[PDB]
Each structure stands twice: as C-alpha cells, then as structure tokens.
Design a protein around this ligand. Structure first.
Ligand SMILES: *[C@@H]1O[C@H](CO)[C@@H](O[C@@H]2O[C@H](CO)[C@@H](O[C@@H]3O[C@H](CO[C@H]4O[C@H](CO[C@H]5O[C@H](CO)[C@@H](O)[C@H](O)[C@@H]5O)[C@@H](O)[C@H](O[C@H]5O[C@H](CO)[C@@H](O)[C@H](O)[C@@H]5O)[C@@H]4O)[C@@H](O)[C@H](O[C@H]4O[C@H](CO)[C@@H](O)[C@H](O)[C@@H]4O)[C@@H]3O)[C@H](O)[C@H]2NC(C)=O)[C@H](O)[C@H]1NC(C)=O
Lengths: 105, 137, 97, 367, 119, 137
C-alpha cells in the first residue's frame, strides 16, 4: 500500500504559537491529500482538501502547503480550541490509508 | 484520484454548477420536462387531466421552435448566425468557465426575441431556396 | 394643501380619497405620527391618539375609494396637520378649529 | 469565428404569476365540512414528495409582494362561503361625494356543522417549481443562500384567527421578527414562536360563558425570549410596554377565533400588561352570534350554539404586534385582522418560479 | 443542516454479523458518494470502503474483500454496512462520511456522523 | 418598379396567390396550426379540451407522416420517387406561375392515397438498407 508518516508524533506548544506538522507519503500522490482534525470522543472534521485549499467554515489561521511526497500543515496562531489530533489521508490509489495522527498539547 | 462513476443530482439540479458541467446532464432534465409515467359525482380529472394536456401542449410549443430552427437532433445543434455586440459582449473566459446559466439568461432576457426572430428568418430562408438551385444539375 | 375649518363642539369631516374604486390599506395619523385610525382590510382600528373615543370612519365608502374621518365633539386642541397614508401617497390636510 | 448553439433543457427559471392547485389529503367520506371542500377542489396527495437540494444558487425571496397570498385569499373565501353558511347576511351595495348606500338581507338555511381545520398542501403543474429558503435565521426578504427546489409544501392548517397565530409552523432556532420596514409605524410586525404555548379554551356545562386557561410560566419565558429579540432592533436600551388594545371592532379589540363552529371572542386585557426594562391565566370569553365578516364589508348573524361542553386545545405559535410610534420607551400593542398577513407567516419561505428550458450560447461548432 | 445519522451501539459475539445503517439529511443522497471508516479504541483511522448511492456500485479494500458488504436504499435515503465473521479485532467505532466529490473523483470527507460503537 | 419589402397576407391568405408566391409564406401558416398558449355544469373543462386533444392528435399524426417520408427538415423537401405523367399533365410555367394551391388540389385530390403509398414505401425501403451495404467497409 501507501504509508503516511506524520511528524512529530507528540508536539507541545503554548497559546499563540506558530506550528508546522509534516506528512510524508511513501509513493507519489500528487496533491491528493486531505487534512482532518479530531477531538477525543467526537468525529473528525475536514480542514484542507486538495492539500492547499481551505474548507468553508474553517478559520483562515490554518494553511497547508506541499507537493509530491512532502506536505505541511501550518497554524499561524494557536487557540485553545485548536488543540486536537491531526490526520492526513490520500486518494490517488486503492486502498485508502490514514496517517498516524499528531496529538498537540 | 479514484472514481466509481457519475451520479444523479436530480431534477433542476446543478443550477449553481458551471456551464460546461451543467451542459453534460441535459438528458435527465429534458426527460423530466415531459415527466409522464404517473399511472358522488367524482370528476376531478376535469381539473387534473386538464393539467396533463397542458403539459403536453407546452412541450409541443417548445418543440415547434426547435422544429423550425431546423435541426431536430435535439439538445445540441448549430446555426450560421453571428452575434451582435449589444447582446452582452463578453469573452470566452467570462462566459464558459466561471458563471452559471442563471446569470447568463438574467442578462440575455432583454434580448430574447431579437435573436429568436433572426434565428427564425435568416438560415431558414437562406439555407432553403438554394439547394433547389443546387438540385438543378 | 387642503384646509378644513371646524366649529367647537360640532362634528367635523375630513376626506381622503384613493386613486381607484377599491378598498385598500389606509392610515390616519397626525403631525407627530401617532396613529388616529387605520384599516386592516375589512376592519377598522383606532390608534393610540387622544381622539380614540371621538374618531370614526364610514365603512361603506371604502368600496368607493373614499376613506373619511369623522371627529365628533370638536375641541380647540384637535387643530393639527393630519396625514393619511394611501397607496404610498402622503395626503396632508390642515384642520382648524 | 465562434458560432451560436442552442440548448434545450438548461436549468433556468423566471418569476411568474401562475395559478397553482391545492392537492390536499382528504378522506372523501366524512362530514367535517373542511373535507367536503378538501375533496371538492383537491386531488389526493403523493406518498413520496421529492426534496431535490441545490448547491450554489442564491435567490432573492420577497414576502410582502408574494403572489401566493392572493391565491390563499381566493380559495379560503371560496371555502368559507360553502362550509359555514350563516343564517342572515347584510352586505351593503352602494350603487352610484353624492352617494347613498343600501344594505341587503340574504337569508339562507343555517344548520349546525362541524368545523375542524385540515392541513392542506399547494402543488404546481408541470413546468414550474417552488424555491424554498432553508435559512434558520431568515430576515424575510432579500437573498437566501440555501435555496431548495420543492414540488410542494408541508401541511398548512387554515385557522382563521386574530391577535395571535394558532396551530402554525414552529421556528428552527430562535424567535424571529419579520417586518417590511421597521420605524414605519403602519405595518403589522409578524413574530414567530420557537416553542408552542399550549392553551386550553372551553365552554363547560348561561351558554355564552367560556373560560380559557393559558400557563403563566411558559408564557412568561416565551415573552422573555420575545423581548430579548425586540431589543436587537431598537438600540438595546429601550423600555418595552405591552398594552391590551386601542378601541375598534370586536374581532380586532379581542382575540377572535373559531372552535367547532362556535365563534369565540376572548378578552386579552390581562394577557398583555407587563412592562420590561434593562399559575394559569383565565380569559373572559363571550360567545356571540352577530359578527363582522373579513371576506367582505358587512354583518352576519348565525344560529344559537349547540348544547354541551365544547373543548379545543391549541398551540399558540406567533404574534401580530404593532408599534405605537410617539416621542424613550416603546409601546407594542397586539393587532391583526388582515388575513393576508395571517397566512403570510406560513407562506413566507416559498416562491413560485417558471422554468424556461431553452437557451443559447456561443461555441465553436459548424454544420 | 447537512448531517448523517447512524444507529445505536451494538454488541455481538464473534462469528456473527453486524449491520449498521446511516441516513442522510440536508442534501440529495443520490449525488454524493459515501465512505465508511472505522477507528479502533486508542488507535488511528482505518478506511473500509466507499459506495455510489446511485448505481449501487461498491469499492472495498482488498484486506476485507468478501467479508464486508455495502448496500443502499434510495426510498428512505439510507446506506447499510454488513460486517460478517467478527473477531475481537473488529471492535471499534464505525463512521459514515459524505465525500465532497468534485470532478467525479474523491476529494475529501466533510460531513461525518455521530458514530456507532461495535464491540 | 420601386419596392420596400414583403407584406403580410395572414392566415389562409395564400389561397388566391400563385403557388410559387405561396411557397415563401408556408411558415407563418405552419406556426399557428396548433396555435398554443390558449390559457355545477361542466363547460370549458370538458367538451373543450376534447377540441385540444383532437387538434394535438391531428398535428402529431401529420408530423409523424411527414417524418416517415423522411425529411424532418420540414416545410420543403425532395424525394426520389418519379412523377407519373398521367396525373394532370401540365407545364412548370403553367403550374408554378399562373395557378393557386386550391385548384391544384382540385385536380390532384383523386390520387392522394396512390401518392401516399408510394411515398410511404418506396424511398424508405430503398434509401435505407443500401447504407447497410454501403457501411460494410
Ligand atoms: C459550487 O461552488 C464551488 C465553489 O465555487 C465549486 O467548487 C469548485 O469546483 C471546481 C470544479 O471544476 C474545482 O476545480 C477543480 O480543481 C481541481 C484541483 O486543482 C488544484 O490543483 C491544480 C494543479 O494541480 C495540477 O498540478 C500539480 C502540480 O502543481 C499536480 O500535482 C496535480 O496532479 C495536477 O496535475 C491547480 O491548477 C488548481 O487551481 C489553482 O491554480 C489555478 C490556475 O489558474 C488558479 O486559478 C486557482 O485559483 C488555484 O490557485 C487547484 O489548486 C482540478 O484538478 C480540476 O480540474 C479538472 O477540471 C477542469 C475543468 O476546468 C479541467 O480543465 C481539468 O483538466 C481537470 O479535469 C478542477 O479545476 C474547484 O477546486 C472547486 N472549489 C473552488 C473553491 O473553486 C463547485 O464545483 C460548485 N458546484 C457544486 C455542485 O458543488
């Protein structure tokens, strides 16, 4: 299959910081990755589709860049509601696999 | 990405979609324009069947226009009429990729009959009356 | 500017006509824009003005496009510029006692 | 270099003024006297209404220039001229400032008929659609972004009433205030409720003495939400006063409605009395027989009521309020009487559009 | 408004079958493809399969091929997931997710249900 | 002499003009054949929708008969059936420049079904099923 590695596995930061989280794909996937946020006990909600475009309803402080196998999610200023688990998942080829998950605290 | 095939959005759907995407699914809409199927004194069909006849008549009226700007291989054909500058002079990158059909007909509704009369008369009296001269030899 | 004169203690008449012969929405207010009386289709409503016990309108002329105003027992303090809103028209009429 | 091409079947609609039919769900066997008319003009409904939902369209809804309330006003007059036939009617004629009016006396047979409302739909023929606004915080006019195309609507129960909205449609999120122009002082402010205010209203075993109980705490918290919503449009610092009425006819100075063919006129003096700044109420109803008509100008007197206790529980779902603009605090007294405004509260989010599936676009084709 | 509603939690013995239903509200069910995703307790997200509600066509991962079956009903706008031959590894939360589906291909999963806990 | 352009005779106005002049004005008669639009005892709701149903059933049958003798780009089309000379033998200047349509029907009305059988059969079993042999390669 295609394996997604997310770095770092656990990140620690304060309120108001700028953070960057890297998704690395084992194969060439073009720009077909999506970025999701999950609170414990609740369903994940989408932030980024097409690896650069913002979902409607998501605030503008989030961004995502990258190409090929190298992919970054960037939060410009951390808010207390933004402290959750972040995922990357692709759709270039079957089967679909999700990332390992990045918990921020 | 991966795919499974196209979908069915419904009657009058994709009105907010782009021009080239909404022009793909005219068959589903045109089939629903005719609808059909359906299957004391107690005569309410005097209203109800009335409505059915009206719907059929409406189709023939539209068919009459599409029968007389003569293609009859419907949902797409072409004519030989060039455009005029007073009828929403826009370029292709304005007109085909970035607006819906609602915003197109919202500005072409001023110029309905002035193009419909020209399409009525010009090719239908000019593509005619010349193949008879071509049938002389 | 129509001006209607009236006597003290009598009944004074104030006319307000429509463009056509049809009963439409109409309102009678004063210069400080407190309602005297308006209509609600087939019904008549009195406003919060001080003429509430003495203002009246005739119901049968409403089909003729006439929306009158009857003020019985006229006092000197009732002399005011009265506005009737009829079909987005502001017919302003001056009343003297 | 580019040639025009025709297209048949493009999703294009225009604003029309067509005539719809009803198609309500009647039984065609009872004598409820709604179901006689509800079969007389209505075909039975469909079991599967379609709910096709659009994606990117934004459409301008309008409330007070809508062309569905006149279609309401025609067939509800046609229904009330057959269902409840009164005994003696007095309608002036005034055949042509030099005029005199004479009144007639039309006398027909007046049996005692059952009367309970039946929810009805309004459905369109082929070639039309009804756009419906799905915004939970709709102002009343202007744009709606979540426009959905609908074959036909939900059940509207045609309850003739004044001063309130009885058995209406509940709001989605919060209490809504709908007005064509605030600070105009001449148009009826329609207010919808987000919760049903339950009321019992009965005549028990003098026959013209009926008592009408409404809960105190639920009404108090409902008007707490209401006076919370009126402070949004008036600077968040004004005092709000609710008066009872200001003169007028008995059908507008009192809460006038119907119950089993009985013509109820309940006083609401103790119901609107509080002043707001920064267990059960009984209503003294009087059953009358010589009433005024809303369909036309005139009088109508009816048969004496039947013997026995009469029961009708109902859900209060809205308000017709009217400002008293003076020269500070604000006075808001209840009003109504205009039935176009009575059924504008349930037809506020609908629009009839006519389809025109014949367009033209420039492309690069030939022959 | 656009929401997916799932059924309640279900506890089953190994070797049995489990059926979960997902009903759509607020959008046209025949126009968007539907994904199923499972999360093990304390673990990440595992994708299962995805279905067209219109044609009834399915696409299933090869790891669970022939064991999980996905069906639809357009009359009540509900999709059904059947997971047969249960072990203790299949315990987790099952989620139905609406594909955004731009350009007749997979884009992203934006509308997610409340979940079904299967033990 | 001096001219300004064509005029408008109206409904059924070509019964007194020459056939060659009547050929240009076929379309304005062909538009309002179906007319369209239109918009307890039961009148105008029964015994009047029967008129509309009869008009629609006549118009659809005539349009189907025109579509069988396959042209479908209607109001003028040619056919590969030879003309029999025994059927009111006249010259082209005599018919197309001096005669009306009604007098021509007055002579040709005895041969209508003999026309219709040959037009109904011969082309559409000989124009077709030779393209079946033509599209072999
Ligand atoms: C309701 O409204 C919404 C909102 O308006 C609407 O949503 C939009 O729908 C359109 C559908 O056409 C979407 O457009 C699609 O976008 C696809 C993704 O493209 C991205 O990537 C492009 C580059 O990728 C190429 O290159 C990289 C290397 O760099 C490579 O790895 C990739 O594999 C790939 O080869 C990029 O160009 C693109 O756009 C950026 O750049 C353009 C440059 O002009 C700029 O204008 C943009 O602003 C942006 O910066 C984007 O980043 C795309 O693949 C897809 O293309 C297909 O269709 C087009 C049809 O024109 C074909 O020409 C093409 O060959 C493909 O077949 C398509 O263009 C759009 O993203 C949606 N969102 C928004 C916000 O607009 C809904 O559709 C509406 N309707 C409904 C029913 O909901």
């Amino acid at each position: 299959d295609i394996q997604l590695t997310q770095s770092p596995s656990f990140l620690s930061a304060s309120v108001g910081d700028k953070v960057t989280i890297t998704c690395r794909a084992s194969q060439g996937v073009r720009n077909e990755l999506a970025w999701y946020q999950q609170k414990p006990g609740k369903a994940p909600n989408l932030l980024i589709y097409y690896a650069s475009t913002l979902q409607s309803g998501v605030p503008s402080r989030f961004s995502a860049t990258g190409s090929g196998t190298h992919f970054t999610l960037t939060v410009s200023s951390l808010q207390p509601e933004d402290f959750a688990t972040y995922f990357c998942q692709h759709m270039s080829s079957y089967p679909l696999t999700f990332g390992g998950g990045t918990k921020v605290e | 990405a991966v795919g499974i095939g196209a979908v069915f959005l419904g009657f009058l759907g994709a009105a907010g979609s782009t021009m080239g995407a909404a022009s793909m699914t005219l068959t589903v809409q045109a089939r629903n324009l005719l609808s059909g199927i359906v299957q004391k004194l107690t005569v309410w069909g005097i209203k109800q069947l009335q409505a059915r006849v009206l719907a059929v008549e409406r189709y023939l009226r539209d068919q009459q226009l599409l029968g007389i700007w003569g293609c009859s291989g419907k949902l797409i054909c072409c004519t030989n009429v060039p455009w005029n500058s007073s009828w929403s002079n826009r370029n292709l990158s304005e007109i085909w990729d970035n607006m819906t059909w609602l915003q197109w007909d919202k500005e072409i509704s001023n110029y309905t009959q002035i193009i419909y009369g020209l399409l009525e008369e010009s090719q239908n009296q000019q593509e005619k009356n010349e193949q008879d001269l071509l049938a002389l030899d | 500017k129509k001006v209607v004169l009236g006597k003290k203690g009598d009944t004074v008449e104030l006319t307000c006509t429509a463009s056509q012969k049809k009963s439409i929405q109409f309102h009678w207010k004063n210069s400080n824009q407190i309602k005297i009386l308006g209509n609600q289709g087939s019904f008549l409503t009195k406003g919060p003005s001080k003429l509430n016990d003495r203002a009246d309108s005739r119901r049968s002329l409403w089909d003729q496009g006439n929306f009158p105003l009857i003020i019985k027992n006229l006092k000197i303090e009732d002399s005011d510029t009265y506005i009737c809103e009829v079909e987005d028209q502001k017919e302003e009429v001056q009343l003297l006692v | 270099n580019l040639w025009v091409t025709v297209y048949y079947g493009v999703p294009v609609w225009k604003d029309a003024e067509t005539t719809l039919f009803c198609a309500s769900d009647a039984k065609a066997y009872e004598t409820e006297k709604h179901n006689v008319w509800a079969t007389h003009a209505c075909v039975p409904t469909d079991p599967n209404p379609q709910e096709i939902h659009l994606e990117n369209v934004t459409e301008e809804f309008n409330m007070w220039k809508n062309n569905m309330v006149e279609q309401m006003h025609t067939d509800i007059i046609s229904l009330w001229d057959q269902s409840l036939k009164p005994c003696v009617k007095l309608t002036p004629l005034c055949v042509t400032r030099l005029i005199n009016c004479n009144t007639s006396a039309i006398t027909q047979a007046c049996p005692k008929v059952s009367f309970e409302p039946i929810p009805i739909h309004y459905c369109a023929p082929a070639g039309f659609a009804i756009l419906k606004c799905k915004d939970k915080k709709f102002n009343g006019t202007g744009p709606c972004p979540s426009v959905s195309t609908v074959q036909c609507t939900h059940g509207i129960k045609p309850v003739v009433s004044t001063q309130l909205l009885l058995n209406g449609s509940l709001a989605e999120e919060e209490v809504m205030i709908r007005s064509e122009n605030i600070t105009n002082n001449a148009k009826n402010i329609l207010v919808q409720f987000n919760t049903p205010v339950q009321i019992n209203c009965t005549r028990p075993n003098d026959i013209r003495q009926a008592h009408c109980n409404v809960s105190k705490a639920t009404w108090n918290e409902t008007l707490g939400k209401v006076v919370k919503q009126l402070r949004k449009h008036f600077g968040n610092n004004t005092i709000i006063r609710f008066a009872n009425s200001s003169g007028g006819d008995l059908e507008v100075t009192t809460h006038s409605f119907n119950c089993g063919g009985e013509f109820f006129y309940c006083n609401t003096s103790g119901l609107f009395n509080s002043t707001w700044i920064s267990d059960s109420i009984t209503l003294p109803c009087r059953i009358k027989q010589i009433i005024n008509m809303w369909q036309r100008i005139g009088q109508a007197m009816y048969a004496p009521p039947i013997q026995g206790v009469i029961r009708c529980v109902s859900n209060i779902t809205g308000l017709i309020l009217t400002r008293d603009g003076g020269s500070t605090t604000e006075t808001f007294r209840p009003g109504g009487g205009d039935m176009r405004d009575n059924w504008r509260s349930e037809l506020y989010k609908y629009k009839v559009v006519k389809i025109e599936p014949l367009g033209v676009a420039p492309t690069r084709c030939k022959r | 408004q656009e929401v997916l509603v799932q059924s309640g939690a279900e506890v089953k013995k190994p070797g049995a079958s489990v059926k979960v239903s997902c009903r759509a509200f607020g959008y046209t069910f025949t126009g968007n493809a539907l994904h199923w995703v499972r999360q093990a307790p304390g673990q990440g997200l595992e994708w299962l399969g995805w279905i067209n509600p219109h044609s009834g066509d399915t696409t299933t991962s090869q790891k669970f091929q022939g064991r999980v079956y996905m069906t639809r009903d357009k009359s009540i706008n509900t999709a059904f997931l059947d997971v047969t031959r249960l072990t203790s590894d299949d315990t987790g939360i099952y989620y139905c997710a609406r594909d955004k589906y731009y350009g007749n291909e997979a884009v992203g999963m934006d509308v997610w249900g409340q979940g079904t806990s299967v033990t």
